[PDB]
């Protein structure tokens, strides 16, 4: 309405850019880790089990 590529462009584009980058990043990093992480653990099943049995 009244706004127009003003100084607020950093606020709107800033937060928006954050949610976007964090979104994509979290996706690739999530599956990315679970991917290699699972294939490298040699067990692929526990998924961050920690000190507690091994079934």
Swiss-Prot record:
Keywords linked to the UniProt accession: Antenna complex, Bacteriochlorophyll, Cell inner membrane, Cell membrane, Chlorophyll, Chromophore, Light-harvesting polypeptide, Magnesium, Membrane, Metal-binding, Transmembrane, Transmembrane helix
Function, as annotated: Antenna complexes are light-harvesting systems, which transfer the excitation energy to the reaction centers.
Membrane topology (Periplasmic): 45-55
GO terms (BP aspect): photosynthesis, light reaction
Residues at which a bacteriochlorophyll binds: 20, 38
Signal peptide (residue range): none
Source species taxonomy: Bacteria, Pseudomonadati, Pseudomonadota, Alphaproteobacteria, Rhodospirillales
A Gene Ontology molecular function term of the record: metal ion binding
Annotated transmembrane regions: 22-44
Predominant location: membrane
Superkingdom as given in the UniProt entry: Bacteria
InterPro entries (alphabetical): Antenna_a/b, Antenna_beta_CS, Antenna_beta_dom_sf, LHB-1/5, Light-harvesting_complex
Name recorded for this polypeptide: Light-harvesting protein B-870 beta chain
GO CC entries: plasma membrane; plasma membrane light-harvesting complex
A Pfam match: LHC
Assembly and oligomerization: The core complex is formed by different alpha and beta chains, binding bacteriochlorophyll molecules, and arranged most probably in tetrameric structures disposed around the reaction center. The non-pigmented gamma chains may constitute additional components.
Cytoplasmic membrane side: 2-21
Membrane topology summary: Single-pass type II membrane protein
Subcellular location(s) of the protein: Cell inner membrane
Family: Belongs to the antenna complex beta subunit family.
């Amino acid at each position: 309405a009244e706004v127009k590529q003003e100084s607020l462009s950093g606020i709107t584009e800033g937060e928006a850019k954050e949610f976007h980058k964090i979104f994509t990043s979290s996706i690739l990093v999530f599956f990315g880790v679970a991917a290699f992480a699972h294939l490298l653990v040699w067990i692929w099943r526990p998924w961050v089990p920690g000190p507690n049995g091994y079934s």
